Structure 1
Amino acid sequence: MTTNYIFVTGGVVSSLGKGIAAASLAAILEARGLNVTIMKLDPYINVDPGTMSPIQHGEVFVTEDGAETDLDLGHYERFIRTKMSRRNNFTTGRIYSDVLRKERRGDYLGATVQVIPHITNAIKERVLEGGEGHDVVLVEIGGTVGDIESLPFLEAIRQMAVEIGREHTLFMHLTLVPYMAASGEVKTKPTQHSVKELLSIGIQPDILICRSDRAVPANERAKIALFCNVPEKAVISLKDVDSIYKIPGLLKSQGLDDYICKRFSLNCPEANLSEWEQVIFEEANPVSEVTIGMVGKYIELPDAYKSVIEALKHGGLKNRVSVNIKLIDSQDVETRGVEILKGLDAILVPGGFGYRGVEGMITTARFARENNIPYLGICLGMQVALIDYARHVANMENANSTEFVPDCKYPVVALITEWRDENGNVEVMRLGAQQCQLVDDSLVRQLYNAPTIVERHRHRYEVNNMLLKQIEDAGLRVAGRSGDDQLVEIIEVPNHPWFVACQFHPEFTSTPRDGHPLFAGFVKAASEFQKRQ
């Protein structure tokens, strides 16, 4: 059976929720038994987001295969069960890097290498690579139509539509239909001007997704249908919602998936959105409420912790607990003290690099441990837990990571090559999914309810096994290990209601439907702490 492509573009503004719209539609199509995947084309020149700052870009999402990707692939995995890889995200940078590699090598046989056809060919090849073997492929084009940065992507998908044909390709264009107080109506003029930009570069939209702060009435949808020459049922209202989990239902209620299946001649049963209806019900009917402090160094952009924030929400769903997430700057802990950590039912220290704000995170880990406040440390969160325990229980003065203090006496965290003890004696970037072995009688062995788990890494600095035994003797427990080097993956403080810290990023395998054993356990502990007060 022929692979079908839905090209997802945006007009008027960038922040239309193209990713959430594509992911929500993919969820409906998957619920009709279709094999669906999603792909993100980013017009930035960065070869990948591995270099990009969290406070500039948002979180770097990590796929099972260890690709560093746009946080949109987090949306994709949280809406469909089709696993994302390197093939589901590429940048203009990646395209030019690969064309330049081929050109300098001599693969173009002395030809003049051109934006058309060579850059556009490279784009089409990567879309086909990610798409072929699926029933429906949703291809999200980053940027706003009319901008120069996305012109090669738009010319590439235009060519694909000509080659493949209108029987197996659709153009789904998101647009802003803004409300004006003065007119007391939503305005289609920006959609008119955006669609004109699309037409000028040879793309006719099949579907209009009308974004607004309210319902786009039938009268306005009728206007858009006429000026775009599309059926009225191909013009969809997507108002601002309190919950993205409702979007699949909102799109299905307007028959969007029916129109797509008709256009692609797909005979498949009606979408059963029971799993999404259940998530919505859970969210709408909490039994109790908690306040969880997230203490990190990137809080100035919450999207720096996108998957962690969603993982905490999923933890809420599974416990019927409403989670109030309080973003706390770890540097404020360094200046103002532990005063700002008061009135928290639990504390989460997420991932990060560089020494800025790390001492505040160590103080935060100490506060949580000493005051029996539920604690979850992720990557850097595990480091500061180990450092806290090394310093203040195992009596290892000024214990630190070689990342922060390279020549510290007790490098309890360090690169495998840097591993040394306090006497200077020695022995004779991990990305993606890896198996972790859980230790018998550990909290995580119970929570995960399995002897082995698979979680995703994005880190280079490990627990120093040369200084580990001393910290173990001081009472800290190793709950998880991995590989031949038996690298520490999970640590637990036993004399504590709930204290867990892991090297891997569990937030990347959390979904609203399936939740996550660790976050479910964490939020449950937060609820139990709140009740005890």
Structure 2
Amino acid sequence: MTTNYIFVTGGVVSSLGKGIAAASLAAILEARGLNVTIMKLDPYINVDPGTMSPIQHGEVFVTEDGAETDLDLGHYERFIRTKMSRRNNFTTGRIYSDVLRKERRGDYLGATVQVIPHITNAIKERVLEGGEGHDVVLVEIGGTVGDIESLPFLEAIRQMAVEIGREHTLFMHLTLVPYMAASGEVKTKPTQHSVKELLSIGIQPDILICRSDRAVPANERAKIALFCNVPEKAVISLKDVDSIYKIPGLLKSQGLDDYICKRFSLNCPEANLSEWEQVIFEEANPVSEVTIGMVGKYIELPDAYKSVIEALKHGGLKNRVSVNIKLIDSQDVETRGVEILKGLDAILVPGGFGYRGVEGMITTARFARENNIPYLGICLGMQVALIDYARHVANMENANSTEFVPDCKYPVVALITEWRDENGNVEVTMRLGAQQCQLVDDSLVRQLYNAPTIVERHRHRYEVNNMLLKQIEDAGLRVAGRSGDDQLVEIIEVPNHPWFVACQFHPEFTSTPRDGHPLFAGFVKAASEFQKRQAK
């Protein structure tokens, strides 16, 4: 079978939704029984996102294979069943760095290494690699057409198009079609100027995804179609919707899939799209609603928690519950006190790094624990709990994590190597990607997950100090999950609490609108119950 590529670009502005539009398209092609995939090309120099601050570009998606990537990969996984790999994401940095080493060790044989073709070639290699055995590959070019940081990417793809030929390649360009309140009309001009931009680099768009407040009247669509030398049909309107789960539907509604299948000469049986409809439906027909407090540190940038939010959302879906997420900065907790934790049906403590707020978190766990509030802790969210418990239950006085106080008497949380006693006795690092995990019989999670073992994704160094374990266990805490090896503790639960769970891995990276996720589903049902009973 011949592979096909859909190059996705955006113009006018960034924050256009190129990531989502591609996933949506993928979803709709998935639905037509096609072997599909997506890949994101990042113009930034960071070798990988492993370095970026969540507040810069958002959260660090972690793939099964332990790669740290752009959040768009999440979008990818929540729209198509294909699993993302290191292969699905790459930055200029990565590109350059490879080329540099190659060169540095002489793979170019004293040749002058240039942007064209050396660099372009490298880009192309990676794209094909990502394509590798798929009917359709969606290649998201990050950035805005017309800036310079993406020139190579573009040149690269332009080349590919020429080589592969247009029978297996398409140019899908997202553009902004602003609404002029005064004139009372939408403007194509921007689209015009942008398209000219593409042309000017040898690229002629095949399809135009017109973003805007509202729909893009046939009138203007025609206008566009005409000046872009694009078939009217190829001009799609992509207005702002109240739920991205609808996006797939609009595309289809406009026979994008078709257009796509025809251009590529593929056999695409008619689809149902029932799964998306169902999601939408569940979404719109809630029974109860609740408020969930998400207490963290990077809350200034919600995208810093993309996946988690979504996961909560899916939770609601699976339970016909409407979730209202109250974003809470730990600072303010230690600052203004628990008072703020008033009015919550459940609480979530996500991962992070710092100490910046840790305290607040802890306090919070404590609060949720003491006040029997359904609580869910992830990564940092788990430690904070261990801590709260050890401190105020095991009476480990000033329990902590070597990450924040390398010399605590009780380093309940610490790297393996650091592992010591309250005395000082010893024993005779970065966990990334998918990891098997054995669930404990008689544990909530064993129930929820409904299986002895599961697989979740990791992104952390600090572990639960096995040395101080038995002690805490003895205090009451319960180990619900472990990881083979040094049987490292992965999940813990508070025994006789309505719903109190905490884990190392990032369940969120595994949840989806379509199939939800056990923990969140449970977390969610729990929160409802709470609210219901808070007046039962």
Query: What interval of TM-score do these two structures reach, taking the shorter chain for normalisation?
Result: over 0.9
Q: 2-side partners of 1:335 and 1:195: how far apart? A: 52
Task: Look up the match of 1:7.
Answer: 7
Provide the rounded CA distance (Å) in 2 between the counterparts of 1:279 and 1:287: 15
Structure 2 Cα separation of the partners of residues 272 and 166 of structure 1: 29
Give CA deviations for 1:135-178 in whole Å, capped at 9, x if unaligned: 00000000000000000000000000000000000000000010
| 1:284-311 CA distance string (max 9 Å, x none) | 0000000000000000000011000000
Give the whole-Å Cα distance in 2 for the aligned partners of 1:132 and 1:444: 37
- Cross-structure match for 1:380: 380
Separation in 2 of the partners of 1:74 and 1:27?
Answer: 13
> Could you tell me how far 1:55 is from its partner in structure 2?
1.2
Question: Secondary structure of 1:416's match?
Answer: coil
Post-superposition offset of 1:483: 2.4
Task: Determine helix, strand or coil for the equivalent of 2:190.
Answer: helix
RMSD: 0.4
- CA–CA distance in structure 1, aligned partners of residues 52 and 366 of structure 2: 31
DSSP-derived class of the 1:126 partner: helix
Encode CA deviations 1:338-390: one digit per residue, 9 max, x unaligned.
Answer: 01110000000000011110000000000000000000000000000000000
Q: Distance in 1 between matches of 2:246 and 2:168?
A: 28
SS in 2 for 1:484: coil
Q: SS in structure 1 opposite 2:391?
A: helix
CA–CA distance in 2 between the matches of 1:248 and 1:362? 41
2:177 matched to 1:177?
yes
Query: Superposed, which structure 2 residues align to 1:1-400 within 5 Å?
Result: 1-400=1-400
* Rounded Cα–Cα distance in structure 2 between residues aligned with 1:271 and 1:152: 37
**Aligned partners of 1:248 and 1:56: how far apart in 2?**
28
The count of corresponding residues between Structure 1 and Structure 2 is: 533
Asked if the contact 2:350/2:379 (under 8 Å) is kept, the reply is yes
Deviations along 1:383-409, whole A, 9 cap, x unmatched? 000000000000101000000000100
Q: What is the rounded CA distance, in whole Å, between the counterparts of 2:181 and 2:371 in structure 1?
A: 52
Q: C-alpha distance in 2, partners of 1:440/1:510?
A: 23
User: Aligned equivalents of 1:524 and 1:454: distance in 2?
Assistant: 22
Deviation at 1:132, TM superposition (A): 1.8
Query: What residue in structure 2 maps to residue 521 of structure 1?
Result: 522
Q: Secondary structure at the match of 2:281?
A: helix
Percent of aligned positions with the same letter in both sequences?
A: 100
The CA deviation string for residues 40-99 of structure 1, in whole angstroms up to 9 with x for no partner, is 000000000001001111000000000000000000000000000000000000000000
- In structure 2, the residue corresponding to 1:119 is in which secondary structure? helix
Q: In 2, Cα distance between the equivalents of 1:326 and 1:56?
A: 22
Q: Is the 8 A contact 2:37 2:136 kept in 1?
A: yes
SS of the residue 2:259 aligns to = helix
- How far is 1:257 from its partner? 0.5
CA contact (8 A) 2:12 2:175 kept: yes
The CA deviation at 1:267 is 1.4
List per-residue Cα deviations over 1:260-290 (Å, max 9, x = no partner).
1000000120121000000000000000000
With normalisation by structure 1, the TM-score equals 1.00
Instruction: State how far apart, in whole Å, the 2-side matches of 1:392 and 1:421 are.
Output: 18
Instruction: Determine the structure 1 residue equivalent to 2:476.
Output: 475
Q: Report the alpha carbon displacement of residue 486 of structure 1 after superposing the two structures with TM.
A: 0.3
The answer to whether the 8 A contact 2:87-2:130 is kept is: yes
- Partners of 1:470 and 1:181 lie apart in 2 by 66
Q: Secondary structure at the match of 2:32?
A: coil
Structure 2 contact 378–502 (Cα < 8 Å) conserved: yes
1:500 corresponding residue in structure 2: 501
Contact 2:5 2:137 in 1 (8 A): yes
- Cα distance, 1:484 vs. partner? 1.3
**2-side partners of 1:435 and 1:369: how far apart?**
28
Instruction: Give the SS at the match of 1:172.
Output: strand
Q: Distance in 2 between matches of 1:404 and 1:116?
A: 48
* Matched residue SS, 2:497: coil
Q: How far apart are 1:450 and its partner, in Å?
A: 0.3
Q: Give 3-state SS (helix, strand or coil) of 1:148's partner.
A: coil
Rounded to whole Å, the distance in 2 between the matches of 1:495 and 1:516 is 23
2-side partners of 1:13 and 1:70: how far apart?
19
Q: Give distance in 2, aligned partners of 1:5 and 1:56.
A: 30
C-alpha distance in 2 between matches for 1:500 and 1:521: 10
Deviation of the 1:230 alpha carbon: 1.0
CA offsets 1:457-504 (integer angstroms, 9 cap, x no match): 000000000000000000000000002100000000012000000000
CA distance in 2, matches of 1:181, 1:290: 37
Distance 1:520 1:148 in 2: 45
Q: Which deviations, in whole Å up to 9, do the C-alpha atoms of 1:306-344 show, x marking residues without a partner?
A: 000000000000000000001100000011000111000
What is the alpha-carbon distance in structure 1 between the residues aligned to residue 323 and residue 87 of structure 2? 34
Query: Residue 245 of structure 2 contacts residue 279 of structure 2 at CA under 8 Å; is this kept in 1?
Result: yes
- Secondary structure at 1:361 match in 2: helix
Contact 2:490 2:503 in 1 (8 A): yes
Q: Distance in 2 between matches of 1:28 and 1:489?
A: 37
Measured after TM superposition, the shift of residue 454 of structure 1 is 0.3
Looking at structure 2, the residues matched to 229 and 250 of structure 1 have their Cα atoms a distance apart, in angstroms, of 23
What SS is found at the alignment partner of 2:122?
helix
Structure 1, unpaired ranges of 5+? none
Comparing 8-17 with 265-274, which one deviates more in the overlay? Answer: 265-274
Q: Is the 8 A contact 2:438 2:484 kept in 1?
A: no
**TM-score under structure 2 length normalisation:** 0.99
Structure 2 CA distance for aligned equivalents of residues 185 and 337 of structure 1 = 50
**Secondary structure, counterpart of 1:418 in structure 2:** coil
Report SS of the residue matched to 1:376: strand
Distance in 2, Cα, partners of 1:508 & 1:20: 17
Segments of 5+ residues of structure 2 without an aligned counterpart are none
CA distance in 1, matches of 2:57, 2:232: 37
Q: Per-residue displacement from partner, 1:439-463 (whole Å, max 9, x unpaired)?
A: 0000000000000000000000000
Q: Which moved more, 1:25-34 or 1:267-276?
A: 267-276
CA distance in 2 between counterparts of 1:430 and 1:74 reads 19
Q: Secondary structure at the match of 2:467?
A: coil
Instruction: State the Cα deviation string for residues 171-195 of structure 1 (Å, max 9, x = none).
Output: 0000001000121111000000000
CA distance in 1, matches of 2:413, 2:260: 53
Q: 2-side partners of 1:202 and 1:351: how far apart?
A: 45
Instruction: Say which SS state the counterpart of residue 365 (structure 1) adopts.
Output: helix
1:83-133 alpha-carbon deviations (Å, 9 max, x no partner): 000000000000000000000000000000000000100000000001120
Runs of 4+ in 1 over 6 A off after TM superposition: none
Q: CA–CA distance in 2 between the matches of 1:192 and 1:85? A: 36
Indicate if the aligned counterparts of 2:390 and 2:399 stay in contact, CA closer than 8 A.
Answer: yes
SS of equivalent to 1:307: helix
Q: 1:417 aligns to what SS in structure 2?
A: coil
